[PDB]
mmCIF file of all heavy atoms in Angstrom:
data_model
loop_
_atom_site.group_PDB
_atom_site.id
_atom_site.type_symbol
_atom_site.label_atom_id
_atom_site.label_comp_id
_atom_site.label_asym_id
_atom_site.label_seq_id
_atom_site.Cartn_x
_atom_site.Cartn_y
_atom_site.Cartn_z
ATOM 1 N N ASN Q 229 17.651 -37.785 29.433
ATOM 2 C CA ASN Q 229 17.163 -39.123 29.763
ATOM 3 C C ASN Q 229 16.130 -39.641 28.793
ATOM 4 O O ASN Q 229 15.665 -40.778 28.986
ATOM 5 C CB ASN Q 229 16.603 -39.016 31.160
ATOM 6 C CG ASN Q 229 15.637 -37.869 31.418
ATOM 7 O OD1 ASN Q 229 15.362 -37.063 30.466
ATOM 8 N ND2 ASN Q 229 15.276 -37.585 32.606
ATOM 9 N N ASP Q 230 15.813 -38.968 27.793
ATOM 10 C CA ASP Q 230 14.825 -39.423 26.786
ATOM 11 C C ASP Q 230 15.521 -40.495 25.920
ATOM 12 O O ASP Q 230 16.696 -40.382 25.578
ATOM 13 C CB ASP Q 230 14.270 -38.258 25.870
ATOM 14 C CG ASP Q 230 13.418 -37.359 26.607
ATOM 15 O OD1 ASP Q 230 13.546 -37.306 27.938
ATOM 16 O OD2 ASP Q 230 12.636 -36.620 26.042
ATOM 17 N N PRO Q 231 14.778 -41.643 25.649
ATOM 18 C CA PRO Q 231 15.262 -42.560 24.804
ATOM 19 C C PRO Q 231 15.424 -42.180 23.429
ATOM 20 O O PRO Q 231 16.273 -42.798 22.550
ATOM 21 C CB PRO Q 231 14.300 -43.795 24.797
ATOM 22 C CG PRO Q 231 13.050 -43.099 25.228
ATOM 23 C CD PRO Q 231 13.546 -41.956 26.293
ATOM 24 N N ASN Q 232 14.762 -41.159 22.962
ATOM 25 C CA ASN Q 232 14.823 -40.673 21.590
ATOM 26 C C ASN Q 232 15.743 -39.457 21.381
ATOM 27 O O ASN Q 232 15.998 -38.957 20.288
ATOM 28 C CB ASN Q 232 13.368 -40.053 21.202
ATOM 29 C CG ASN Q 232 12.325 -41.217 20.898
ATOM 30 O OD1 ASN Q 232 12.743 -42.314 20.495
ATOM 31 N ND2 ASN Q 232 11.157 -40.869 21.071
ATOM 32 N N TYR Q 233 16.453 -39.090 22.513
ATOM 33 C CA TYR Q 233 17.393 -38.075 22.515
ATOM 34 C C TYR Q 233 18.657 -38.393 21.565
ATOM 35 O O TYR Q 233 19.127 -37.555 20.840
ATOM 36 C CB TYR Q 233 18.106 -37.769 23.917
ATOM 37 C CG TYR Q 233 19.260 -36.966 23.896
ATOM 38 C CD1 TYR Q 233 19.248 -35.636 23.667
ATOM 39 C CD2 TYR Q 233 20.498 -37.450 24.301
ATOM 40 C CE1 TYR Q 233 20.351 -34.783 23.646
ATOM 41 C CE2 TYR Q 233 21.608 -36.742 24.299
ATOM 42 C CZ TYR Q 233 21.573 -35.434 24.015
ATOM 43 O OH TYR Q 233 22.758 -34.678 24.070
ATOM 44 N N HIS Q 234 19.080 -39.700 21.598
ATOM 45 C CA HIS Q 234 20.121 -40.152 20.531
ATOM 46 C C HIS Q 234 19.639 -39.976 19.201
ATOM 47 O O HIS Q 234 20.444 -39.690 18.224
ATOM 48 C CB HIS Q 234 20.562 -41.525 20.906
ATOM 49 C CG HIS Q 234 21.166 -41.688 22.206
ATOM 50 N ND1 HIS Q 234 20.511 -41.596 23.370
ATOM 51 C CD2 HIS Q 234 22.434 -42.096 22.550
ATOM 52 C CE1 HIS Q 234 21.250 -41.756 24.505
ATOM 53 N NE2 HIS Q 234 22.508 -42.101 23.917
ATOM 54 N N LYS Q 235 18.321 -40.170 18.940
ATOM 55 C CA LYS Q 235 17.686 -39.929 17.634
ATOM 56 C C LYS Q 235 17.898 -38.531 17.166
ATOM 57 O O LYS Q 235 17.888 -38.287 16.055
ATOM 58 C CB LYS Q 235 16.135 -40.314 17.724
ATOM 59 C CG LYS Q 235 15.923 -41.776 18.166
ATOM 60 C CD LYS Q 235 16.514 -42.588 17.302
ATOM 61 C CE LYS Q 235 16.260 -44.148 17.617
ATOM 62 N NZ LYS Q 235 16.779 -45.096 16.640
ATOM 63 N N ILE Q 236 18.044 -37.569 18.131
ATOM 64 C CA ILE Q 236 18.341 -36.135 17.767
ATOM 65 C C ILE Q 236 19.787 -36.167 17.375
ATOM 66 O O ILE Q 236 20.214 -35.639 16.227
ATOM 67 C CB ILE Q 236 18.078 -35.089 18.735
ATOM 68 C CG1 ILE Q 236 16.546 -35.188 19.065
ATOM 69 C CG2 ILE Q 236 18.519 -33.829 18.452
ATOM 70 C CD1 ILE Q 236 15.692 -34.914 17.777
ATOM 71 N N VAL Q 237 20.708 -36.735 18.210
ATOM 72 C CA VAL Q 237 22.061 -36.588 18.073
ATOM 73 C C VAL Q 237 22.688 -37.182 16.732
ATOM 74 O O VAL Q 237 23.438 -36.591 15.994
ATOM 75 C CB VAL Q 237 22.825 -37.226 19.265
ATOM 76 C CG1 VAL Q 237 24.365 -36.906 19.158
ATOM 77 C CG2 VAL Q 237 22.322 -36.577 20.518
ATOM 78 N N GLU Q 238 22.144 -38.412 16.474
ATOM 79 C CA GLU Q 238 22.527 -39.083 15.194
ATOM 80 C C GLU Q 238 22.063 -38.238 14.009
ATOM 81 O O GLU Q 238 22.642 -38.150 12.986
ATOM 82 C CB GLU Q 238 21.892 -40.373 15.101
ATOM 83 C CG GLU Q 238 22.546 -41.391 16.178
ATOM 84 C CD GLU Q 238 21.804 -42.789 16.291
ATOM 85 O OE1 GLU Q 238 20.965 -43.015 15.484
ATOM 86 O OE2 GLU Q 238 22.303 -43.689 17.053
ATOM 87 N N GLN Q 239 20.751 -37.701 14.228
ATOM 88 C CA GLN Q 239 20.311 -36.783 13.202
ATOM 89 C C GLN Q 239 21.237 -35.548 13.069
ATOM 90 O O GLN Q 239 21.404 -35.062 11.922
ATOM 91 C CB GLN Q 239 18.814 -36.232 13.618
ATOM 92 C CG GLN Q 239 18.114 -35.398 12.505
ATOM 93 C CD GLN Q 239 16.668 -35.135 12.855
ATOM 94 O OE1 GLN Q 239 16.208 -35.575 13.991
ATOM 95 N NE2 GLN Q 239 16.018 -34.339 11.922
ATOM 96 N N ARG Q 240 21.708 -35.046 14.133
ATOM 97 C CA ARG Q 240 22.666 -33.941 14.035
ATOM 98 C C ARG Q 240 24.092 -34.572 13.440
ATOM 99 O O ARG Q 240 24.565 -33.835 12.633
ATOM 100 C CB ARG Q 240 22.950 -33.493 15.537
ATOM 101 C CG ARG Q 240 21.881 -32.488 15.937
ATOM 102 C CD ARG Q 240 22.026 -32.159 17.512
ATOM 103 N NE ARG Q 240 21.082 -31.193 17.930
ATOM 104 C CZ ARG Q 240 20.931 -30.715 19.089
ATOM 105 N NH1 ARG Q 240 21.677 -31.223 20.100
ATOM 106 N NH2 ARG Q 240 20.140 -29.817 19.365
ATOM 107 N N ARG Q 241 24.336 -35.793 13.772
ATOM 108 C CA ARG Q 241 25.443 -36.421 13.046
ATOM 109 C C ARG Q 241 24.990 -36.716 11.667
ATOM 110 O O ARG Q 241 26.000 -36.851 10.684
ATOM 111 C CB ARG Q 241 25.842 -37.750 13.802
ATOM 112 C CG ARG Q 241 26.595 -37.530 15.083
ATOM 113 C CD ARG Q 241 26.861 -38.847 15.710
ATOM 114 N NE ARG Q 241 27.917 -38.682 16.782
ATOM 115 C CZ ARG Q 241 28.112 -39.521 17.678
ATOM 116 N NH1 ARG Q 241 27.446 -40.731 17.787
ATOM 117 N NH2 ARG Q 241 29.160 -39.245 18.708
ATOM 118 N N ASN Q 242 23.707 -36.835 11.204
ATOM 119 C CA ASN Q 242 23.371 -36.807 9.878
ATOM 120 C C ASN Q 242 23.520 -35.541 9.193
ATOM 121 O O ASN Q 242 23.326 -35.407 7.977
ATOM 122 C CB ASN Q 242 21.924 -37.519 9.758
ATOM 123 C CG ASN Q 242 21.830 -38.888 10.061
ATOM 124 O OD1 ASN Q 242 22.896 -39.606 9.805
ATOM 125 N ND2 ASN Q 242 20.773 -39.287 10.732
ATOM 126 N N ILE Q 243 23.553 -34.342 10.022
ATOM 127 C CA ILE Q 243 23.639 -33.054 9.400
ATOM 128 C C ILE Q 243 25.030 -32.931 8.576
ATOM 129 O O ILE Q 243 25.084 -32.422 7.613
ATOM 130 C CB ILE Q 243 23.319 -31.983 10.472
ATOM 131 C CG1 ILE Q 243 22.030 -31.964 10.888
ATOM 132 C CG2 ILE Q 243 23.816 -30.574 9.942
ATOM 133 C CD1 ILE Q 243 20.889 -31.791 9.723
ATOM 134 N N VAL Q 244 26.106 -33.331 9.354
ATOM 135 C CA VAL Q 244 27.414 -33.104 8.881
ATOM 136 C C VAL Q 244 27.756 -34.210 7.901
ATOM 137 O O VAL Q 244 28.882 -34.094 7.246
ATOM 138 C CB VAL Q 244 28.429 -32.961 9.980
ATOM 139 C CG1 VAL Q 244 28.127 -31.861 10.926
ATOM 140 C CG2 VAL Q 244 28.588 -34.318 10.780
ATOM 141 N N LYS Q 245 26.971 -35.320 7.832
ATOM 142 C CA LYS Q 245 27.466 -36.485 7.073
ATOM 143 C C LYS Q 245 26.928 -36.471 5.599
ATOM 144 O O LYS Q 245 27.687 -36.760 4.709
ATOM 145 C CB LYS Q 245 26.948 -37.738 7.802
ATOM 146 C CG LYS Q 245 27.488 -39.034 7.239
ATOM 147 C CD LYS Q 245 26.825 -40.241 7.856
ATOM 148 C CE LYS Q 245 27.047 -40.286 9.257
ATOM 149 N NZ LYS Q 245 28.464 -40.473 9.556
ATOM 150 N N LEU Q 246 25.742 -36.004 5.451
ATOM 151 C CA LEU Q 246 25.139 -36.183 3.981
ATOM 152 C C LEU Q 246 25.741 -34.933 3.217
ATOM 153 O O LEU Q 246 26.077 -33.830 3.688
ATOM 154 C CB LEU Q 246 23.576 -36.034 4.103
ATOM 155 C CG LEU Q 246 22.748 -34.880 4.772
ATOM 156 C CD1 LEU Q 246 22.552 -33.706 3.735
ATOM 157 C CD2 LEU Q 246 21.510 -35.370 5.288
ATOM 158 N N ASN Q 247 25.826 -35.223 1.898
ATOM 159 C CA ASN Q 247 26.214 -34.189 0.904
ATOM 160 C C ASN Q 247 24.905 -33.733 0.082
ATOM 161 O O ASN Q 247 24.150 -34.499 -0.386
ATOM 162 C CB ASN Q 247 27.266 -34.817 -0.059
ATOM 163 C CG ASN Q 247 26.821 -36.130 -0.613
ATOM 164 O OD1 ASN Q 247 26.171 -36.844 0.033
ATOM 165 N ND2 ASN Q 247 27.500 -36.503 -1.787
ATOM 166 N N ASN Q 248 24.795 -32.453 -0.106
ATOM 167 C CA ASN Q 248 23.816 -31.851 -0.761
ATOM 168 C C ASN Q 248 23.991 -31.695 -2.182
ATOM 169 O O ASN Q 248 23.015 -31.282 -2.938
ATOM 170 C CB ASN Q 248 23.350 -30.501 -0.124
ATOM 171 C CG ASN Q 248 24.577 -29.523 -0.084
ATOM 172 O OD1 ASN Q 248 24.750 -28.781 -1.225
ATOM 173 N ND2 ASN Q 248 25.314 -29.452 1.006
ATOM 174 N N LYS Q 249 25.147 -32.095 -2.713
ATOM 175 C CA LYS Q 249 25.473 -31.947 -4.125
ATOM 176 C C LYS Q 249 25.805 -33.310 -4.635
ATOM 177 O O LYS Q 249 26.446 -34.137 -4.002
ATOM 178 C CB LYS Q 249 26.683 -31.003 -4.232
ATOM 179 C CG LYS Q 249 26.493 -29.527 -3.924
ATOM 180 C CD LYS Q 249 25.307 -29.008 -4.706
ATOM 181 C CE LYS Q 249 25.026 -27.582 -4.460
ATOM 182 N NZ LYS Q 249 23.875 -26.995 -5.122
ATOM 183 N N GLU Q 250 25.294 -33.525 -5.851
ATOM 184 C CA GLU Q 250 25.533 -34.772 -6.624
ATOM 185 C C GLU Q 250 26.635 -34.592 -7.545
ATOM 186 O O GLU Q 250 27.011 -33.508 -7.860
ATOM 187 C CB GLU Q 250 24.308 -35.242 -7.321
ATOM 188 C CG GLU Q 250 23.873 -34.381 -8.435
ATOM 189 C CD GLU Q 250 23.122 -33.285 -8.075
ATOM 190 O OE1 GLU Q 250 22.533 -33.181 -6.844
ATOM 191 O OE2 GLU Q 250 22.890 -32.219 -8.931
ATOM 192 N N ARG Q 251 27.247 -35.758 -7.946
ATOM 193 C CA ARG Q 251 28.468 -35.716 -8.885
ATOM 194 C C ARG Q 251 27.818 -35.478 -10.217
ATOM 195 O O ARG Q 251 26.651 -35.499 -10.505
ATOM 196 C CB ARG Q 251 29.222 -36.985 -8.817
ATOM 197 C CG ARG Q 251 30.065 -37.122 -7.544
ATOM 198 C CD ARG Q 251 30.773 -38.390 -7.473
ATOM 199 N NE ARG Q 251 31.692 -38.519 -6.308
ATOM 200 C CZ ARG Q 251 32.387 -39.632 -5.952
ATOM 201 N NH1 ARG Q 251 32.211 -40.735 -6.560
ATOM 202 N NH2 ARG Q 251 33.023 -39.580 -4.817
ATOM 203 N N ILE Q 252 28.836 -35.126 -11.154
ATOM 204 C CA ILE Q 252 28.508 -34.838 -12.556
ATOM 205 C C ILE Q 252 28.098 -36.170 -13.232
ATOM 206 O O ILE Q 252 28.433 -37.246 -12.832
ATOM 207 C CB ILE Q 252 29.739 -34.233 -13.320
ATOM 208 C CG1 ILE Q 252 29.276 -33.501 -14.584
ATOM 209 C CG2 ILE Q 252 30.869 -35.206 -13.495
ATOM 210 C CD1 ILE Q 252 30.281 -32.500 -15.158
ATOM 211 N N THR Q 253 27.258 -36.192 -14.251
ATOM 212 C CA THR Q 253 26.750 -37.287 -14.946
ATOM 213 C C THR Q 253 27.645 -37.522 -16.103
ATOM 214 O O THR Q 253 27.893 -36.499 -16.942
ATOM 215 C CB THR Q 253 25.245 -37.006 -15.281
ATOM 216 O OG1 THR Q 253 24.531 -36.678 -14.241
ATOM 217 C CG2 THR Q 253 24.746 -38.352 -16.010
ATOM 218 N N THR Q 254 28.018 -38.665 -16.310
ATOM 219 C CA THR Q 254 29.046 -39.136 -17.426
ATOM 220 C C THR Q 254 28.145 -39.829 -18.472
ATOM 221 O O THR Q 254 27.504 -40.776 -18.156
ATOM 222 C CB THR Q 254 30.015 -40.015 -16.916
ATOM 223 O OG1 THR Q 254 30.920 -39.384 -16.038
ATOM 224 C CG2 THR Q 254 31.027 -40.334 -18.114
ATOM 225 N N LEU Q 255 28.234 -39.286 -19.713
ATOM 226 C CA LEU Q 255 27.543 -39.957 -20.819
ATOM 227 C C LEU Q 255 28.291 -41.198 -21.176
ATOM 228 O O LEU Q 255 29.400 -41.188 -21.752
ATOM 229 C CB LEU Q 255 27.324 -38.967 -21.993
ATOM 230 C CG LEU Q 255 26.767 -37.594 -21.715
ATOM 231 C CD1 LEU Q 255 26.784 -36.742 -22.891
ATOM 232 C CD2 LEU Q 255 25.198 -37.925 -21.353
ATOM 233 N N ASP Q 256 27.505 -42.399 -21.064
ATOM 234 C CA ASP Q 256 28.130 -43.717 -21.329
ATOM 235 C C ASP Q 256 27.985 -44.210 -22.677
ATOM 236 O O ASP Q 256 28.547 -45.284 -22.947
ATOM 237 C CB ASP Q 256 27.696 -44.605 -20.188
ATOM 238 C CG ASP Q 256 26.126 -44.735 -20.207
ATOM 239 O OD1 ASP Q 256 25.546 -43.845 -20.790
ATOM 240 O OD2 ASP Q 256 25.500 -45.521 -19.539
ATOM 241 N N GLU Q 257 27.159 -43.530 -23.460
ATOM 242 C CA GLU Q 257 26.841 -44.059 -24.855
ATOM 243 C C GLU Q 257 28.069 -43.802 -25.878
ATOM 244 O O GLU Q 257 29.113 -43.282 -25.299
ATOM 245 C CB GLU Q 257 25.538 -43.504 -25.323
ATOM 246 C CG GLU Q 257 25.593 -41.936 -25.478
ATOM 247 C CD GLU Q 257 24.248 -41.450 -25.935
ATOM 248 O OE1 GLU Q 257 23.328 -42.243 -26.283
ATOM 249 O OE2 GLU Q 257 24.111 -40.221 -25.999
ATOM 250 N N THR Q 258 27.893 -44.111 -27.091
ATOM 251 C CA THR Q 258 28.889 -43.792 -28.083
ATOM 252 C C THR Q 258 29.027 -42.352 -28.225
ATOM 253 O O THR Q 258 28.000 -41.651 -28.384
ATOM 254 C CB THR Q 258 28.554 -44.544 -29.495
ATOM 255 O OG1 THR Q 258 28.421 -45.962 -29.089
ATOM 256 C CG2 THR Q 258 29.615 -44.459 -30.395
ATOM 257 N N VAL Q 259 30.183 -41.872 -28.408
ATOM 258 C CA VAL Q 259 30.535 -40.465 -28.543
ATOM 259 C C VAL Q 259 30.023 -39.907 -29.779
ATOM 260 O O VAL Q 259 29.657 -38.675 -29.828
ATOM 261 C CB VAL Q 259 32.107 -40.262 -28.392
ATOM 262 C CG1 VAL Q 259 32.495 -40.627 -26.949
ATOM 263 C CG2 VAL Q 259 32.862 -41.019 -29.353
#
Side-chain angles (χ1 to χ4, degrees):
Chain Q
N229 44 10
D230 289 17
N232 289 330
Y233 167 71
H234 297 68
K235 303 298 181 179
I236 297 307
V237 181
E238 299 177 357
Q239 186 175 1
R240 287 171 172 175
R241 284 176 169 167
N242 288 324
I243 289 303
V244 302
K245 189 188 299 298
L246 60 86
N247 49 331
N248 58 86
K249 292 305 180 182
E250 70 276 347
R251 286 178 178 174
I252 199 166
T253 306
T254 303
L255 300 173
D256 51 349
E257 59 182 357
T258 302
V259 296

